[PDB]
Amino acid sequence: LSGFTVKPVATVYRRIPNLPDCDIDNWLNNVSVPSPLNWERRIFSNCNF
Amino acid sequence: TNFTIAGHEEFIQTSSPKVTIDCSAFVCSNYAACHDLLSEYGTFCDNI
Numbered sequence: 001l002s003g004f005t006v007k008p009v010a011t012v013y014r015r016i017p018n019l020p021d022c023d024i025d026n027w028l029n030n031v032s033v034p035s036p037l038n039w040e041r042r043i044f045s046n047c048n049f
Numbered sequence: 050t051n052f053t054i055a056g057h058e059e060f061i062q063t064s065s066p067k068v069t070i071d072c073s074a075f076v077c078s079n080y081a082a083c084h085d086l087l088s089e090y091g092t093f094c095d096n097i
């Protein structure tokens with residue numbers, strides 16, 4: 001007959017607590033608007049969003 | 050004039066390990082959505 005798999009009985013979830021936010025909304029909503037000729041790049045890492 | 054007795058050995062293969070392969074456990078291990086696409090290939094899973 002066909003096969004079978006052992007059904008899980010729990011769930012493991014691990015994350016890094018007390019981590020600051022990425023505050024991406026403040027970067028997009030800025031008064032200084034760039035130009036397509038001199039566009040910049042900002043890297044978001046080690047934060048929550 | 051003088052003789053002796055010699056001994057030789059020979060091996061002849063008569064058997065082979067019997068392997069068993071199936072469609073489910075080889076292609077779609079535990080994914081339910083994987084078996085949906087295998088339904089179209091229904092006949093091409095029993096001839097194997």
Ligand SMILES: *[C@@H]1O[C@H](CO)[C@@H](O[C@@H]2O[C@H](CO)[C@@H](O)[C@H](O)[C@H]2NC(C)=O)[C@H](O)[C@H]1NC(C)=O
Pocket residue numbers: 026030031032
């Ligand atoms: C909008 O963009 C400007 C850049 O033109 C940001 O001003 C910089 O702010 C950082 C602090 O976060 C300073 O270290 C830099 O010296 C500033 N650059 C300047 C004054 O040219 C500004 O923070 C961004 N956000 C807002 C809300 O204005």
Ligand SMILES: *[C@@H]1O[C@H](CO)[C@@H](O)[C@H](O)[C@H]1NC(C)=O
Pocket residue numbers: 050051052
């Ligand atoms: C044959 O060879 C064996 C081996 O040493 C020996 O013992 C025997 O005497 C020999 N016989 C003759 C007839 O030469």
